């Protein structure tokens, strides 16, 4: 007999590590349908900011225009969402972008010959021969000056090589960075990889003490199995440390003395980030999206 | 296509999330059906899958010159030992989970890195359609050729296939 | 012989003759052998298969008998024979890299795959011919699985987010 | 051409690590497997993108119709 | 190791083409039946 008060008696979270870019943590005693839905929403439904419309004024370099437009969109921007709003598509392009929807980046690079002493390195040999992603400067439109004064728009990885040039060539563009979700295009996905794994279960069946237990160590990562003596013989220290290689299931000594399975309601989330948001904050957004994905169906008339 | 004659069209740009995901978080770029391999007998693709994943982990290139290995020096033993030192399964199998349901799969999935090619003929220069258009001046029939917005041919045998159904109005 | 080819000793030194190198077993030196000679010789394939007092020559490498494009197929001795023959035709018809001097040419049409990669699994003759100057393809994490249902009889499944990040994009 | 910005499979930013990779192989003189692990590439999806990149843009840029050869 | 991708050997060669001698000499030998057959019209014995 299930109840939401019985779910709360038996639900735990163990946070193994938290960081600016990644977070490993456990969700104990939750169903696979709910734990998949948090993974499902972190990849797609959580919105993030990326460049969408690119306006080339000149591109005289070797890289094509649409290839170089595609490379700007994949550059992750260090912008907090809930500082922008959503664009509205049922109205024309003069009315579509405001200072509340859009972040305007620009890029203006020209390459020239450098007088240098001599196969020489082309950073000592040319001026502006490498367009990095930090050369996308932020242009505050409208009132994005008193609200972005704390945090200007900078790419999350400023050393991304966008293009390479030779003298004579130039790149002069201007891009609009709109808010979108990972289901539309992959460049809005706010996460490098969110994924989970089940806790492995390593069930020893017979006591396998002694010299067999020393060779039982080596079928696993080193922190997994431990020994003490013939008593406290060969036990599991850290099954969470184990990757399921099934190395022990191919030695005929051990193929009946152990069984490998999972703990089917212990999920180990590893949530990384593309830099725009902290990884514990794209999990709070993900559980609030699924809550607000259900309110909008409850607070809704059932048609026909 | 891969380097083994295993070609086939892209059937669906399958969305990312409901695509199976490994223990590592890696989601495959290409899913290929195992039912190709029994009639094809392309086992160079199984060992390329197994040597490529060994090579990505250890940072090494592997040789695949033919007749380097031997019946006493099977490459499944050679590259599987390199996976087992890396920490993976010996047989190239990986524990994957279902992207749709969320549960783990029945067995482990054979994953690896295969060098895929992209062939040069695509649907954007294969498809055609005609409601009506330019005709020929002698026969008043639709013209041959796609760029001239021309027509599909109902040849000799397709006439016979419509007499065989007994449908005289489709033939008409 | 008895009712065989007409006997004789025929030297040839002219133009246009086919010639390939083998190792002459006394002196361990390279010899050059043409196809008229080869019918009556005894050329061992590997040095491990040199039998006493029949073999006078040995191949340098057994891969001197394949083509250039048939020699780049990884582990070609494990595929079935029509599949190594079909890669040799599919390897021509890829969109790869025609050349780098494309701004000084004007052809009817060129196909240019944008971001090529070298292979992890490759032959040693991939580097002798300088095939790195023309990268033809890319390395995909391929999973052999029947999962979706849309991949039958030859069809495959691409990833969507792999494609949005540019995966076999070409002009 | 130029290094891809993101990995194809996972989606980690990979484009900022190509010039750091060539410094490690040239200046610090490591092998390829140790230089990739020091840049943070550890899933073998993103590991084979810096590893296996050709970088043909240095071969395209030699042909420049905007300056005297 | 068994084989290698020659990553620093490519990148020093893409930027700096060799000023003396063609690398990859097996590639110029693979069209010696064509280039040589046209060279024999004007070179060799008896002009």
């Amino acid at each position: 007999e299930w109840n939401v008060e019985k779910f709360k008696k038996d639900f735990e979270v163990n946070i193994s590590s938290l960081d600016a870019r990644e977070a490993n943590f456990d969700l104990i005693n939750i169903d696979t349908s709910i734990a998949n839905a948090f993974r499902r929403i972190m990849i797609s439904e959580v919105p993030s900011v990326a460049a969408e419309y690119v306006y080339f004024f000149n591109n005289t370099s070797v890289i094509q225009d649409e290839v170089l437009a595609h490379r700007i969109g994949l550059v992750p921007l260090k912008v907090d969402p809930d500082m922008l709003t959503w664009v509205d598509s049922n109205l024309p392009d003069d009315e579509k972008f405001t200072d509340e929807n859009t972040i305007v980046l620009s890029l203006n690079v020209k390459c020239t010959r450098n007088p240098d002493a001599p196969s020489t390195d082309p950073k000592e040999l040319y001026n502006n021969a490498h367009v990095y992603a930090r050369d996308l400067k932020f242009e505050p439109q409208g009132r994005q000056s008193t609200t972005f004064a704390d945090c200007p728009v900078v790419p999350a990885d400023p050393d991304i090589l966008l293009a390479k040039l030779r003298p004579g060539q130039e790149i002069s563009l201007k891009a609009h960075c709109i808010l979108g979700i990972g289901g539309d295009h992959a460049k809005f996905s706010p996460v490098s990889t969110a994924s989970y794994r089940l806790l492995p279960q390593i069930n020893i069946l017979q006591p396998i003490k002694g010299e067999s237990a020393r060779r039982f160590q080596k079928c696993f990562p080193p922190g997994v199995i431990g020994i003490d003596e013939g008593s406290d013989e060969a036990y599991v220290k850290d099954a969470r440390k184990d990757t399921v290689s099934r190395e022990v299931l191919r030695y005929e000594e051990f193929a009946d003395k152990v069984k490998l399975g999972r703990v089917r309601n212990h999920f180990i989330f590893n949530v990384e980030s593309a830099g725009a948001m902290t990884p514990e904050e794209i999990f709070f957004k993900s559980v609030r999206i699924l809550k607000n994905k259900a309110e909008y169906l409850k607070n809704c008339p059932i048609t026909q | 296509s891969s380097r083994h004659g295993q070609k086939g069209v892209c059937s669906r740009k399958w969305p990312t999330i409901d695509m199976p995901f490994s223990e590592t978080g890696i989601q495959p770029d290409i899913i290929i059906n195992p039912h190709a391999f029994p009639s094809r007998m392309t086992i160079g693709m199984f060992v390329e899958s197994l040597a490529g994943k060994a090579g990505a982990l250890h940072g090494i290139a592997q040789d695949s010159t033919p007749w380097i290995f031997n019946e006493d020096d099977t490459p499944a033993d050679y590259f599987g030992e390199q996976l087992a030192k890396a920490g993976y399964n010996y047989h190239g199998n990986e524990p994957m989970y279902s992207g749709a349901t969320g549960e783990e799969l029945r067995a482990d999935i054979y994953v690896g890195v295969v060098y895929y090619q992209r062939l040069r003929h695509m649907v954007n220069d294969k498809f055609q359609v005609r409601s009506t258009g330019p005709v020929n001046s002698l026969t008043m029939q639709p013209v041959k050729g796609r760029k001239r917005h021309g027509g599909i041919r109902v040849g000799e045998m397709e006439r016979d296939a419509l007499i065989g159904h007994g449908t005289s109005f489709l033939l008409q | 012989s008895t009712r065989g080819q007409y006997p004789g000793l025929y030297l040839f030194g002219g133009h246009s003759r086919m010639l390939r190198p083998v190792r002459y077993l006394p002196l361990d030196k390279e010899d050059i052998v043409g196809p008229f000679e080869q019918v009556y010789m005894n050329i061992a394939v590997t040095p491990q298969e040199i039998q006493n007092n029949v073999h006078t020559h040995v191949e340098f490498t057994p891969t001197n008998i394949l083509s250039i494009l048939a020699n780049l197929t990884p582990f070609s001795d494990f595929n079935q024979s029509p599949r190594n023959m079909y890669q040799c035709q599919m390897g021509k018809q890829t969109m790869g890299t025609p050349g780098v001097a494309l701004c000084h040419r004007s052809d009817n049409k060129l196909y240019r795959l944008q971001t090529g990669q070298t292979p992890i699994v490759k032959a040693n003759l991939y580097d002798d011919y300088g095939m790195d100057n023309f990268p033809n393809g890319f390395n995909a994490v391929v999973a052999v699985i029947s999962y979706t249902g849309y991949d039958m009889d030859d069809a495959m499944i691409i990833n969507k987010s792999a494609d949005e990040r540019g995966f076999g994009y070409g002009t | 051409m130029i290094v891809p910005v993101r990995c194809f499979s996972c989606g980690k930013v990979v484009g900022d690590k190509w010039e750091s990779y060539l410094n490690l192989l040239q200046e610090d003189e490591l092998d390829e497997g140790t230089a990739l692990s020091r840049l943070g590439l550890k899933r073998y999806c993103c590991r084979r993108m810096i590893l296996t990149h050709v970088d043909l843009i240095e071969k395209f840029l030699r042909y420049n119709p905007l300056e005297k050869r | 190791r068994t084989a290698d991708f020659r990553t620093l050997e490519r990148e020093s060669r893409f930027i700096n083409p060799p000023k003396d001698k063609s690398a990859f000499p097996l590639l110029q030998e693979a069209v010696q039946p064509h280039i040589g057959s046209f060279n024999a019209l004007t070179e060799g014995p008896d002009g």
Binding site: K241 | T24, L57, D73, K85 | - | G33 | -
Partner: peptide
């Protein structure tokens, strides 16, 4: 016939999620 030369110098390069080099 000499065998295919084993590459010497391999080590563990795949770890569980949340564990980098805690193994010696």
């Amino acid at each position: 016939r000499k065998d295919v030369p084993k590459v010497e110098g391999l080590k563990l390069e795949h770890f569980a999620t949340g564990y980098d080099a805690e193994d010696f």
